[PDB]
Short mmCIF file of N, CA, C and O in Angstrom, two decimals:
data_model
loop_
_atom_site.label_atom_id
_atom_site.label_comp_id
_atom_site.label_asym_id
_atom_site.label_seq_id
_atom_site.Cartn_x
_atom_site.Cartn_y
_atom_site.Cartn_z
N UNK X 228 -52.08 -20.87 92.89
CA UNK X 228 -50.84 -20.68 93.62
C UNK X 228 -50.75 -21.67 94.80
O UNK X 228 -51.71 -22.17 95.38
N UNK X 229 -49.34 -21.87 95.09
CA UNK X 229 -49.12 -22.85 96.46
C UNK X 229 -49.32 -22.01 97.75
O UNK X 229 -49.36 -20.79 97.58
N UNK X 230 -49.44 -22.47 98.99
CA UNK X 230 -49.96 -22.24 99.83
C UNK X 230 -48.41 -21.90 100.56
O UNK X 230 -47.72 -22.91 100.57
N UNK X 231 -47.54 -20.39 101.34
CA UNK X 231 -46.58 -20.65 101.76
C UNK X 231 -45.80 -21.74 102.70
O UNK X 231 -46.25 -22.85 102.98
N UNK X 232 -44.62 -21.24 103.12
CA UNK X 232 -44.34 -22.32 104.08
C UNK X 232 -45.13 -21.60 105.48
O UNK X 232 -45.63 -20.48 105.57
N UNK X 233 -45.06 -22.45 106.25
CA UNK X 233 -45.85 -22.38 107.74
C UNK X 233 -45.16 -21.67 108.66
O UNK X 233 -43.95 -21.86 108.61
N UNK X 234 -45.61 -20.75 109.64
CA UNK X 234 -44.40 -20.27 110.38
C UNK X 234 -43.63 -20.78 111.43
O UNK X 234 -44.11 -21.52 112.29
N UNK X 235 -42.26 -20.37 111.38
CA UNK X 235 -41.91 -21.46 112.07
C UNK X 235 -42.13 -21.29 114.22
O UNK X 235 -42.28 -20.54 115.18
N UNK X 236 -41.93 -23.09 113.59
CA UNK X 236 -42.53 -22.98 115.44
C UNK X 236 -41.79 -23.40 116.05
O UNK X 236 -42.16 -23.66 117.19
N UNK X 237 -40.27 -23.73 115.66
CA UNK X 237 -38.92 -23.90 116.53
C UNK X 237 -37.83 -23.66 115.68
O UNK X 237 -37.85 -24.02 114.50
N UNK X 238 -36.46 -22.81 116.42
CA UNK X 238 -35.86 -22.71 116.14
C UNK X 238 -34.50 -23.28 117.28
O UNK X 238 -34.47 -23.05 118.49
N UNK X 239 -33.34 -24.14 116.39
CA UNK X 239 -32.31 -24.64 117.46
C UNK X 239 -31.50 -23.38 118.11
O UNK X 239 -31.20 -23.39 119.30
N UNK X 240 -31.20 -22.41 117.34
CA UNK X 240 -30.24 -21.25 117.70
C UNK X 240 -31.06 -20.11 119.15
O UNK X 240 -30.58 -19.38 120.01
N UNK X 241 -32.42 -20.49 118.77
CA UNK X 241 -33.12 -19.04 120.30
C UNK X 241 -32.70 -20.03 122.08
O UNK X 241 -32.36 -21.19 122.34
N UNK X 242 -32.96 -18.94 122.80
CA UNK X 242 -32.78 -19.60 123.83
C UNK X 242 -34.32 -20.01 124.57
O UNK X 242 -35.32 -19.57 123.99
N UNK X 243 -34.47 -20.68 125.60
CA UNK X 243 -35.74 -20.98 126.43
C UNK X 243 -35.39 -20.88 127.48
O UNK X 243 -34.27 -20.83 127.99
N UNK X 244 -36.86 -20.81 128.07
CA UNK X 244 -37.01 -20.30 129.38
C UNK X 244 -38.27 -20.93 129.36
O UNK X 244 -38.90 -21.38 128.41
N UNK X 245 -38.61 -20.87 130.89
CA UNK X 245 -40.08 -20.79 131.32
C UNK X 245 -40.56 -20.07 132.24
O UNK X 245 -40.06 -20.22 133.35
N UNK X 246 -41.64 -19.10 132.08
CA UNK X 246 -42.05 -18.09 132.61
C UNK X 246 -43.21 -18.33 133.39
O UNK X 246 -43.34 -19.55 133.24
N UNK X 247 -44.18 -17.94 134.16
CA UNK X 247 -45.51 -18.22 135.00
C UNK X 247 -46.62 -18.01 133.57
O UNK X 247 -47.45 -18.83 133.19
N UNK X 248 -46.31 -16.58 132.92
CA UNK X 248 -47.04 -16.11 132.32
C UNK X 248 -47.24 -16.90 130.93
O UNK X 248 -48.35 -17.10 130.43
N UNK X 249 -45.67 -17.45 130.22
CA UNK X 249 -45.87 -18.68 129.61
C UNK X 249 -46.92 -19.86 129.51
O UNK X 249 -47.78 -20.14 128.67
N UNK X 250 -46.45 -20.55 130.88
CA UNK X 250 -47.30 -21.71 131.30
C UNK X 250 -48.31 -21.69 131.46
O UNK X 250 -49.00 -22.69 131.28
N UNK X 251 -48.95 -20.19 132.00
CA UNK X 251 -50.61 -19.85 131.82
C UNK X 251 -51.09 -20.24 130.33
O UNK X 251 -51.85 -21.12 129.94
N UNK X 252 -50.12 -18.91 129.43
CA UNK X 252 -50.59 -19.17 128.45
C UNK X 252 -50.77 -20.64 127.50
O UNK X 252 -51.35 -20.56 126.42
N UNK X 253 -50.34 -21.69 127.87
CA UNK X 253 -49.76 -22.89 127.20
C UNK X 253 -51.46 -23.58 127.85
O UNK X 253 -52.50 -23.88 127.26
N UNK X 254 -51.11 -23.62 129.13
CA UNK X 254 -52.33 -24.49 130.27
C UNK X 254 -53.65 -24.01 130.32
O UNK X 254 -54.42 -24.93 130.56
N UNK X 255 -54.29 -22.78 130.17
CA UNK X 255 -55.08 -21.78 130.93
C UNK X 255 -55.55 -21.33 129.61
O UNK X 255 -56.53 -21.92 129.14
N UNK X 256 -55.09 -20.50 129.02
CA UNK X 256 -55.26 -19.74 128.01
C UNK X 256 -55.55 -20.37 126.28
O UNK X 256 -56.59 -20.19 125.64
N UNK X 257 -54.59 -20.96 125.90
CA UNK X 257 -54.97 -21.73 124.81
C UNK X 257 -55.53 -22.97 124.92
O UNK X 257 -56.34 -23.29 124.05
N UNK X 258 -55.26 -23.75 125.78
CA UNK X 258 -56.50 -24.65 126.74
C UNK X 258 -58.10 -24.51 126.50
O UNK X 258 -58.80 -25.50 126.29
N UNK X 259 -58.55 -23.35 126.55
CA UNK X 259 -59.62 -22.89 126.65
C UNK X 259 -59.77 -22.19 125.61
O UNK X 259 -60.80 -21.53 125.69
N UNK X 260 -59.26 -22.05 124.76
CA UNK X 260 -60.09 -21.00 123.28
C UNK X 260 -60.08 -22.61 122.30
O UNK X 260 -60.96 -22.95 121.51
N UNK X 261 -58.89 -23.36 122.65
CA UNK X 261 -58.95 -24.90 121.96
C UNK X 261 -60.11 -25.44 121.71
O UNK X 261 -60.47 -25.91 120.62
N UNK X 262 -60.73 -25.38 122.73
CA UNK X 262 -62.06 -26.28 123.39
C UNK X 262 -63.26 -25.78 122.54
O UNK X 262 -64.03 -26.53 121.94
N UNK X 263 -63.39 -23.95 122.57
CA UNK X 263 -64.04 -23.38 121.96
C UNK X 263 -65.05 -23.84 120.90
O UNK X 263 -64.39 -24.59 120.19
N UNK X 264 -66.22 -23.79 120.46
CA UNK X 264 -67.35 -24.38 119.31
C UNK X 264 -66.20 -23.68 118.09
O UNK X 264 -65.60 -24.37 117.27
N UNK X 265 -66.08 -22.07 118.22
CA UNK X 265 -65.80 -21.59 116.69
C UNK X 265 -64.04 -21.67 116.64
O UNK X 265 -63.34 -20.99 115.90
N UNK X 266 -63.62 -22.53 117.48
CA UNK X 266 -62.24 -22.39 117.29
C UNK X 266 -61.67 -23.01 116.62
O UNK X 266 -60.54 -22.56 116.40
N UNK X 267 -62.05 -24.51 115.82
CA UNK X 267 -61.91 -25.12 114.71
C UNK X 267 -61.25 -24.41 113.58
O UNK X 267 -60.54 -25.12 112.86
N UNK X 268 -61.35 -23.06 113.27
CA UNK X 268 -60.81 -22.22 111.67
C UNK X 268 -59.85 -22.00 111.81
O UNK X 268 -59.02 -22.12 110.91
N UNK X 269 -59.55 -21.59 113.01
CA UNK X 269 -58.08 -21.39 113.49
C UNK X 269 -56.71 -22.35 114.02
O UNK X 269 -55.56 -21.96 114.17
N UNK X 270 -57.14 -23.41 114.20
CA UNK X 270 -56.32 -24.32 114.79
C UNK X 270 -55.38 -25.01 113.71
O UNK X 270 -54.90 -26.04 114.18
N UNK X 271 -55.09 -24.83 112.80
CA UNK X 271 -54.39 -24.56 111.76
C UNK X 271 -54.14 -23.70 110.66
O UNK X 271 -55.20 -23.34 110.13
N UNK X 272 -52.85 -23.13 109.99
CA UNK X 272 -52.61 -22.44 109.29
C UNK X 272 -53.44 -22.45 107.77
O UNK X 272 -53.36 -23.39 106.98
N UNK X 273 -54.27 -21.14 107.52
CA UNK X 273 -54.91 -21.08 106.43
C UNK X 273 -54.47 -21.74 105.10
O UNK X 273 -53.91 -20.98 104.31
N UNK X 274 -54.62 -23.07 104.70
CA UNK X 274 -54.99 -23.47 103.41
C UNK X 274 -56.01 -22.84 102.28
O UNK X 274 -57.16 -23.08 101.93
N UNK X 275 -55.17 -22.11 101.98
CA UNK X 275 -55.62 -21.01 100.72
C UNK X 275 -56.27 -22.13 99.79
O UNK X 275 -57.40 -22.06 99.31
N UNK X 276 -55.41 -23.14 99.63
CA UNK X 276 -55.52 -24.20 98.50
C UNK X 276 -56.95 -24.89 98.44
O UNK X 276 -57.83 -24.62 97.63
N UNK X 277 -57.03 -26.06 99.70
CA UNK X 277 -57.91 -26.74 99.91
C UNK X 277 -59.78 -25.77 100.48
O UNK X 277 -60.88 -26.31 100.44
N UNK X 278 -59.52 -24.51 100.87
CA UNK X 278 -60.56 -23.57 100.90
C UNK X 278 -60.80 -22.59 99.98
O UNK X 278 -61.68 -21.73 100.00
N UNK X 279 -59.61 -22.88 98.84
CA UNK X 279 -60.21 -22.15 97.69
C UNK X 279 -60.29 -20.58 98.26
O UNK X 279 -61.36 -20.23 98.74
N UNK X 280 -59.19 -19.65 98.23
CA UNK X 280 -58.50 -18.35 98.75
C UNK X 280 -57.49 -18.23 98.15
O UNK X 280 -56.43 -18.28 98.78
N UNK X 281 -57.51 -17.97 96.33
CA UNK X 281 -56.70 -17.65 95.61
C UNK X 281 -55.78 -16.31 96.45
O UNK X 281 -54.57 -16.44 96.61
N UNK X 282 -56.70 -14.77 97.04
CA UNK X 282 -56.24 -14.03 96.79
C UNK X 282 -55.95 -13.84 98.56
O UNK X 282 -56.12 -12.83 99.25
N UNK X 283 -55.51 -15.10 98.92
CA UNK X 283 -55.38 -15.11 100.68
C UNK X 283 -54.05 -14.27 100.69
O UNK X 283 -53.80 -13.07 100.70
N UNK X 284 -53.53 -15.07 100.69
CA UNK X 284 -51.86 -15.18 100.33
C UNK X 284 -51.12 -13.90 100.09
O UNK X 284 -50.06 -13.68 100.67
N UNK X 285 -51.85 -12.74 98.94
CA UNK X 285 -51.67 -12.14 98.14
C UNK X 285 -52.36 -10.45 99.38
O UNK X 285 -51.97 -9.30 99.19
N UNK X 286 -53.03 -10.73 100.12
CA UNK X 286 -53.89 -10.09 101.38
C UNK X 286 -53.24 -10.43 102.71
O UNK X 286 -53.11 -9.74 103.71
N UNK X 287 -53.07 -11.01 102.59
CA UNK X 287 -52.25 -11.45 104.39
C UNK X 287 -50.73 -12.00 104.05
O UNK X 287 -50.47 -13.05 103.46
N UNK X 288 -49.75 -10.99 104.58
CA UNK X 288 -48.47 -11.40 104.85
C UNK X 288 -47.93 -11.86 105.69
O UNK X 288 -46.88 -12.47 105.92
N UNK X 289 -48.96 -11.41 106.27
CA UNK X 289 -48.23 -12.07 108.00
C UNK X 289 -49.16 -12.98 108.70
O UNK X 289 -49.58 -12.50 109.75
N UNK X 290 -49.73 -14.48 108.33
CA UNK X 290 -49.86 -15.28 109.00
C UNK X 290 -49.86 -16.01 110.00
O UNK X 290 -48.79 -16.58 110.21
N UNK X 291 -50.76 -16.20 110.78
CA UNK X 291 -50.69 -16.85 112.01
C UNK X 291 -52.07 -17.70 112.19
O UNK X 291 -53.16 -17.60 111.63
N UNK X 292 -51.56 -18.62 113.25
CA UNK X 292 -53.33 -19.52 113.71
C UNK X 292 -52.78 -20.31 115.14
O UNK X 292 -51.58 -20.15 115.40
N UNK X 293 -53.61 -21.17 116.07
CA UNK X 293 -53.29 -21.07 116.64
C UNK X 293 -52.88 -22.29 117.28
O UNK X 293 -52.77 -22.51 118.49
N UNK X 294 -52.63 -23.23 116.09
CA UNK X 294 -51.91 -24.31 115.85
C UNK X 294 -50.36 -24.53 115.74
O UNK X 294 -49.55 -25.43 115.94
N UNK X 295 -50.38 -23.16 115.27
CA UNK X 295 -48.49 -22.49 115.28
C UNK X 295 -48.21 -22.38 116.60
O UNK X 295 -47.26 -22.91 117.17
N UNK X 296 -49.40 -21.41 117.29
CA UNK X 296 -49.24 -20.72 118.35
C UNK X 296 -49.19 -21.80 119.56
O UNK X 296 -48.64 -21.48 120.61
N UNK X 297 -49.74 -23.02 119.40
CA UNK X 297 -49.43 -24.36 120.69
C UNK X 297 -47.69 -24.49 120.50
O UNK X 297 -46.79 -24.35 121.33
N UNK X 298 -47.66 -24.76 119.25
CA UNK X 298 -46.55 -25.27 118.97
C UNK X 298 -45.52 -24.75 119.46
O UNK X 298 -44.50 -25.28 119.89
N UNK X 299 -45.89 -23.40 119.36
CA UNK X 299 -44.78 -22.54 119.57
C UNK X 299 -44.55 -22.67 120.93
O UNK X 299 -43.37 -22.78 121.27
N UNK X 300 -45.61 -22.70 122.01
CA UNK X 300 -45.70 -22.60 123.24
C UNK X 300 -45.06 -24.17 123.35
O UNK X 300 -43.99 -24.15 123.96
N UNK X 301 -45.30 -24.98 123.08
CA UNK X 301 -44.77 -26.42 123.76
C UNK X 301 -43.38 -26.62 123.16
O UNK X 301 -42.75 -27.58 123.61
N UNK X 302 -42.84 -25.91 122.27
CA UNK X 302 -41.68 -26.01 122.07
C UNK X 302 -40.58 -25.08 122.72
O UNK X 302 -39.39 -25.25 122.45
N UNK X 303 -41.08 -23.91 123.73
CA UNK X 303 -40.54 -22.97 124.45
C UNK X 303 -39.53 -22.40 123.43
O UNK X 303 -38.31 -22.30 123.55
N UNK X 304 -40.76 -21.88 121.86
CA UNK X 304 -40.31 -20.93 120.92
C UNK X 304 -40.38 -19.43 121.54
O UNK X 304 -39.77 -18.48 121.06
N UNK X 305 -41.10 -19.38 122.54
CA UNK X 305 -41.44 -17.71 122.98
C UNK X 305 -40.62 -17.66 124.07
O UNK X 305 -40.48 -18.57 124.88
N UNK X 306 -39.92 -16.31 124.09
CA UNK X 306 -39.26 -15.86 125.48
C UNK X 306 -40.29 -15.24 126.36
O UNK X 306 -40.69 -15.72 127.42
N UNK X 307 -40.69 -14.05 125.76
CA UNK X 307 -41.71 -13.52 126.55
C UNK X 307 -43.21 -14.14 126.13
O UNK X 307 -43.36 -14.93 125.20
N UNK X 308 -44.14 -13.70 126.87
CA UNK X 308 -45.41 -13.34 126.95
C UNK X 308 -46.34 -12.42 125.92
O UNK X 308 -47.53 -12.59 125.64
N UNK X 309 -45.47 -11.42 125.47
CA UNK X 309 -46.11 -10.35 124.86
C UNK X 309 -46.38 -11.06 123.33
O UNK X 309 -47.49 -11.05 122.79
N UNK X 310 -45.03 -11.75 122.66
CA UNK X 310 -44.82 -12.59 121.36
C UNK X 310 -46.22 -13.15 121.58
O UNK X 310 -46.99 -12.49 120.88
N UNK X 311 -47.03 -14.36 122.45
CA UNK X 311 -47.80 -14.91 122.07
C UNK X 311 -49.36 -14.15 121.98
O UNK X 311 -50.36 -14.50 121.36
N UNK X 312 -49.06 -12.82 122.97
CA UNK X 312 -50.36 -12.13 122.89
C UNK X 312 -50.27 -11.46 121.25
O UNK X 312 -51.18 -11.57 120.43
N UNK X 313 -48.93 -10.73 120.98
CA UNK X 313 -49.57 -10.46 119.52
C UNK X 313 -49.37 -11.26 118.78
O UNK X 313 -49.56 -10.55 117.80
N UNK X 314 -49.05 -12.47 118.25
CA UNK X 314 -49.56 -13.67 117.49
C UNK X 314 -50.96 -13.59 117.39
O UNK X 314 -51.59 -13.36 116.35
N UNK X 315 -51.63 -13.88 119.06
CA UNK X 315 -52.84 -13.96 118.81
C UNK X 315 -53.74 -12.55 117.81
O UNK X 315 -54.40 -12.65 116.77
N UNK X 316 -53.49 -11.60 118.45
CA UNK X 316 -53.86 -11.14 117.48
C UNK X 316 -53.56 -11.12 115.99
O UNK X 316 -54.27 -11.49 115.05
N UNK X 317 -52.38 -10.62 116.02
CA UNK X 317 -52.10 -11.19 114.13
C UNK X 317 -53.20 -11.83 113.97
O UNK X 317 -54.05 -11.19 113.36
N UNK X 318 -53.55 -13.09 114.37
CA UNK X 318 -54.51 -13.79 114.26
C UNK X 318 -55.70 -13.27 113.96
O UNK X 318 -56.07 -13.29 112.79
N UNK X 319 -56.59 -12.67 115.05
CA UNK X 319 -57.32 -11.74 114.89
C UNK X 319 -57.69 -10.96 113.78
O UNK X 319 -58.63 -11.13 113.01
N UNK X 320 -56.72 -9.97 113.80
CA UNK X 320 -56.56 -9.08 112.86
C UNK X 320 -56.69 -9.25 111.42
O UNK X 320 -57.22 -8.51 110.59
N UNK X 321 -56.03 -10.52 111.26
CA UNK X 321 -55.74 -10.71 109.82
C UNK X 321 -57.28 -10.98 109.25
O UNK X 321 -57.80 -10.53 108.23
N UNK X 322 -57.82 -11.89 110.27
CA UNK X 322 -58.98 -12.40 109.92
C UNK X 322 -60.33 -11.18 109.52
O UNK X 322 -61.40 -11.42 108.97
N UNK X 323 -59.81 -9.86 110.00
CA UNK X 323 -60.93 -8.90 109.73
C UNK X 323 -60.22 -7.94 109.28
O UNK X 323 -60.39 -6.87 109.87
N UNK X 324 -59.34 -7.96 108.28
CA UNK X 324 -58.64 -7.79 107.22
C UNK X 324 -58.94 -8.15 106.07
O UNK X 324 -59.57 -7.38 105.34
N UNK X 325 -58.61 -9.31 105.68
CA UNK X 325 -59.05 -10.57 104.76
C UNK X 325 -60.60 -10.12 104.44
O UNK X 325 -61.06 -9.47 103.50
N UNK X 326 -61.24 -10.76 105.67
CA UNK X 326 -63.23 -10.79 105.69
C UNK X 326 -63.82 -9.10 105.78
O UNK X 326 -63.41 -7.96 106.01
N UNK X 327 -64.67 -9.60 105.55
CA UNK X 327 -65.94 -8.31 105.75
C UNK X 327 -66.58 -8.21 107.33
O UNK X 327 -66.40 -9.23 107.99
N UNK X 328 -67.22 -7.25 107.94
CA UNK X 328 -67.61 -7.24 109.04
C UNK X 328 -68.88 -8.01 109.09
O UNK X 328 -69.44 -7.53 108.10
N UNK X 329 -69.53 -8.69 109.47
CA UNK X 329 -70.75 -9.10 109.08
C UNK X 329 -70.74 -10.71 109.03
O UNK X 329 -71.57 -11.47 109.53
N UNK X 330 -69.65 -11.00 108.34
CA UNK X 330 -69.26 -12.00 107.51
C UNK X 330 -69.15 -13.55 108.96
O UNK X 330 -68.80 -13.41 110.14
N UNK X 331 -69.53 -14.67 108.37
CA UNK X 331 -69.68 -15.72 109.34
C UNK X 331 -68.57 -15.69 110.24
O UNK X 331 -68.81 -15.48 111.43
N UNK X 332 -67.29 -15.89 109.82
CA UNK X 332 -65.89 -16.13 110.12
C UNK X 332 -65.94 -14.78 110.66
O UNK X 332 -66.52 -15.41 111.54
N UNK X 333 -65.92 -13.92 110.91
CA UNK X 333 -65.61 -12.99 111.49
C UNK X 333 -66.35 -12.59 112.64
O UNK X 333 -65.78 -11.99 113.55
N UNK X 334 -67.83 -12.90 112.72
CA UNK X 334 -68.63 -13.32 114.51
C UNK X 334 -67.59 -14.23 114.50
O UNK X 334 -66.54 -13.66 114.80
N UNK X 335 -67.45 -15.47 114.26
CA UNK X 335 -66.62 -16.84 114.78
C UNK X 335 -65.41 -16.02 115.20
O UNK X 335 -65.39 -15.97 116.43
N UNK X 336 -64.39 -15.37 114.67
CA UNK X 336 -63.23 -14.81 115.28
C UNK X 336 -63.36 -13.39 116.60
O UNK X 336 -62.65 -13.24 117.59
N UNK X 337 -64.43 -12.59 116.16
CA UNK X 337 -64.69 -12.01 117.08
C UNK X 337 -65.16 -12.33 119.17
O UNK X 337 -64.98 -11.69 120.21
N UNK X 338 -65.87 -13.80 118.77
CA UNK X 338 -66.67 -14.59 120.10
C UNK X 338 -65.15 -15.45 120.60
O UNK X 338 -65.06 -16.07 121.66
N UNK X 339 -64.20 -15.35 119.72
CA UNK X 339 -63.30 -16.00 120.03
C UNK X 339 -62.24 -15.11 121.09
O UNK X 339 -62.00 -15.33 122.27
N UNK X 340 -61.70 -13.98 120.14
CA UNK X 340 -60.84 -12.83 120.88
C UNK X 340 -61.64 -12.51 121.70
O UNK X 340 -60.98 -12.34 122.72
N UNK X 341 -62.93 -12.27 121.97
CA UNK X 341 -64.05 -11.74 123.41
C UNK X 341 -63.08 -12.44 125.08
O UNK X 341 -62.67 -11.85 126.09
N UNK X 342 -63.06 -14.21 124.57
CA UNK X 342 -62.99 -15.01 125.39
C UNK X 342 -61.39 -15.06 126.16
O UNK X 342 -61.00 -15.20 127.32
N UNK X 343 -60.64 -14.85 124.68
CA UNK X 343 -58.97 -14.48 124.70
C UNK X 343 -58.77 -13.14 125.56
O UNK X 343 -57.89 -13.13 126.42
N UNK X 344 -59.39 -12.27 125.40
CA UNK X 344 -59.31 -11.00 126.31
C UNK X 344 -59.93 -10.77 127.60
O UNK X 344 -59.80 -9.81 128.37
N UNK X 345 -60.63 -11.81 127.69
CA UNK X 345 -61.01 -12.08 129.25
C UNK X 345 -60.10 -12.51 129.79
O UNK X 345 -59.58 -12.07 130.82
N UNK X 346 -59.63 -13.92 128.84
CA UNK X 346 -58.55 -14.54 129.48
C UNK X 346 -57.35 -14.44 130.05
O UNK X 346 -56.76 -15.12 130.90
N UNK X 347 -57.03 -13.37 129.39
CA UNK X 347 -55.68 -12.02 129.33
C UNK X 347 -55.60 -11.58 130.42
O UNK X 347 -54.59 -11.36 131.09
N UNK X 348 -56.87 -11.39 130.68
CA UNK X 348 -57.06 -9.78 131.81
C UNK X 348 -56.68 -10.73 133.37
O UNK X 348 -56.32 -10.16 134.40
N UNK X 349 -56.88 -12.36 133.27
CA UNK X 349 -56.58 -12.84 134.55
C UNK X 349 -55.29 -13.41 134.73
O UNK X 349 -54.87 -13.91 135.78
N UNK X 350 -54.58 -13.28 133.51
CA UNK X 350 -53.12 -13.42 133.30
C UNK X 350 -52.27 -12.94 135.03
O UNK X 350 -52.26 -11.77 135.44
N UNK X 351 -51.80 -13.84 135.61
CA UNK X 351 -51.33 -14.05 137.00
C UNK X 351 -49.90 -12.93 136.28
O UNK X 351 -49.47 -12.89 135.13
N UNK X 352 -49.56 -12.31 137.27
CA UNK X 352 -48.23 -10.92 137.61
C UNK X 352 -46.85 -11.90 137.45
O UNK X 352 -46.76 -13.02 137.96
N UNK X 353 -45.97 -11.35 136.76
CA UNK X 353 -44.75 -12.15 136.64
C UNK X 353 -43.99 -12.19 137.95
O UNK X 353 -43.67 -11.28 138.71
N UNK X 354 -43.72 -13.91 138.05
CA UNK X 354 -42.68 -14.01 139.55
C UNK X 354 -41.31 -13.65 139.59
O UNK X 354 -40.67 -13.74 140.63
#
């Protein structure tokens, strides 16, 4: 099977803004899980194809990574704050959904959200 389309990471019809809590998240926040050793799996949308995950596709409907999730942020696709926190998870989630507990990719996603939920917690108060 083909691999879907990608989600989208701009649309002409939403409106923008820029928020404090935004720009954290854009500068501060994905900045720093980027950089990350295990953050490589995520920084683009799962290729079922080229990793051989016939039954990805068919297990996860709701897709995300966090290559969407820049995008989305530098294209001022998000109004609020909350959209990019649950992306991230989607993210998360899907990944220990999909996998087994135990499983390589899933320490790698777990040491990841550890760092994301620290990061969260210093998330500066909206001006």
């Amino acid at each position: 099977s083909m691999n879907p389309p990608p989600p989208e990471t701009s649309n002409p019809n939403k409106p923008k803004r820029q928020t404090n809590q935004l720009q954290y998240l854009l500068r501060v926040v994905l900045k720093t899980l980027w950089k990350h050793q295990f953050a490589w799996p995520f920084q683009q949308p799962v290729d079922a194809v080229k990793l051989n995950l016939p039954d990805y596709y068919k297990i996860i409907k709701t897709p995300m990574d966090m290559g969407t999730i820049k995008k989305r942020l530098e294209n001022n696709y998000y109004w609020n704050a909350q959209e990019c926190i649950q992306d991230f998870n989607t993210m998360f989630t899907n990944c220990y959904i999909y996998n087994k507990p135990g499983d390589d990719i899933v320490l790698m996603a777990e040491a990841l959200e550890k760092l994301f939920l620290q990061k969260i917690n210093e998330l500066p108060t909206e001006e």
